[PDB]
């Protein structure tokens, strides 16, 4: 019963495991979390591409082989954060947990996946520049030190006009102001900014109405959103969790029935059945956590935030 090679990459690390015919998604995850030393697991998941090109999350409950993981030598997984909190500030408790979000969000912005205006960009870059190098000191940090650093989204490089140096000089100015800022805060401060971005935390899907117009259905922490195909930023129709009563689907048809019966029902169409199941999958997840975060803190969570207060407090 030969084992199946697997590669799981964290944000800043590569892990190589060996699975079997019937190793559940759970097992794999549980191990990755153990090997990485991550506790707040409810935020992550293993991501991958299916036989037919789409990205998606590994179902923990059904088996790893028993889902469309692209058939390639080491099965490729990305231990990447699945759900985003409503306020990065008081939901991400541990340094490590705080971390992987920072790095995950950074990449996304640098890859234009999460849009970002040039100013917000330069500021964000400055915070990372603070978190990587520490305090600006001129004696060591002379001009062009940010020469070899990836810092800004591409869209703000190609669509503008500064040289790389000028741009660098801006990050440079901001960098000077963030003095005496530990990397923990530098990182959190980054996220605080980023979470207010229009695209942050949104899962986009390709769909159509009944006519046949292209549309984007987004699933985020607060509910659903229907976007116009050319505007992935502004929702043309939002469906907060509390205004929806029940979400359902048949092969390619999806329906969003509003809690208000005087209101009509919404329906969009999905390319393949797999996408509708995946959309509903994410809706459970976020909603699930949307409630867990409006009820008292689990004891485990309590001692976490507690033990966390002592890890940044002081001494004598």
């Amino acid at each position: 019963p030969k084992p199946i090679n697997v590669r799981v990459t964290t944000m800043d690390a590569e892990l190589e495991f060996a699975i079997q015919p019937n190793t559940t998604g759970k097992q794999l995850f549980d191990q990755v979390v153990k090997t990485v030393g991550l506790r707040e697991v409810w935020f992550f998941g293993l991501q991958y591409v299916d036989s037919k090109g789409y990205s998606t999350w590994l179902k923990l409950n059904k088996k790893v082989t028993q889902q469309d993981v692209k058939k390639e030598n080491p099965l490729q997984f990305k231990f990447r954060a699945k759900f985003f909190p409503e306020d990065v500030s008081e939901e991400l408790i541990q340094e490590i947990t705080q971390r992987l979000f920072f790095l995950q969000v950074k990449e996304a912005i640098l890859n234009d996946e999460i849009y970002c205006p040039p100013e917000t960009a330069v500021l964000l870059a400055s915070y990372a520049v603070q978190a990587k190098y520490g305090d600006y000191n001129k004696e060591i940090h002379k001009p062009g030190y940010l020469a070899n650093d990836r810092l800004l989204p591409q869209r703000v490089l190609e669509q503008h006009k500064l040289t790389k140096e000028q741009w660098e000089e801006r990050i440079q100015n901001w960098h000077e102001e963030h003095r005496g800022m530990l990397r923990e805060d530098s990182m959190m401060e980054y996220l605080k900014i980023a979470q207010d971005l229009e695209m942050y935390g949104v899962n986009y899907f390709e769909i159509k109405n009944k006519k046949g117009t292209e549309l984007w259905l987004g699933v985020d922490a607060l509910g659903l959103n229907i976007y116009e195909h050319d505007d992935k930023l502004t929702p043309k129709i939002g469906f907060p969790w509390s205004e929806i009563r029940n979400i359902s689907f048949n092969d390619k048809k999806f329906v969003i029935k509003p809690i208000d019966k005087k209101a009509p029902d919404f329906v969009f169409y999905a390319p393949r059945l797999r996408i509708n199941k995946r959309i509903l999958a994410l809706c459970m997840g976020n909603h699930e956590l949307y409630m867990r975060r409006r009820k008292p803190d689990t004891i485990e969570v309590q001692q976490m935030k507690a033990q966390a207060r002592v890890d940044s407090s002081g001494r004598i």
Binding site: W241, S242, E243, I244, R245, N246, I247, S248, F249, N250, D251, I259, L273, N276, K277, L280, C283, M284, H287, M291
Partner: peptide, 15 residues
């Protein structure tokens, strides 16, 4: 095989 599916949210059930 597996074709259909739904999740009841606001339904006075989950609070």
């Amino acid at each position: 095989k597996r074709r259909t599916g739904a999740l009841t949210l606001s339904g006075g059930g989950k609070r």
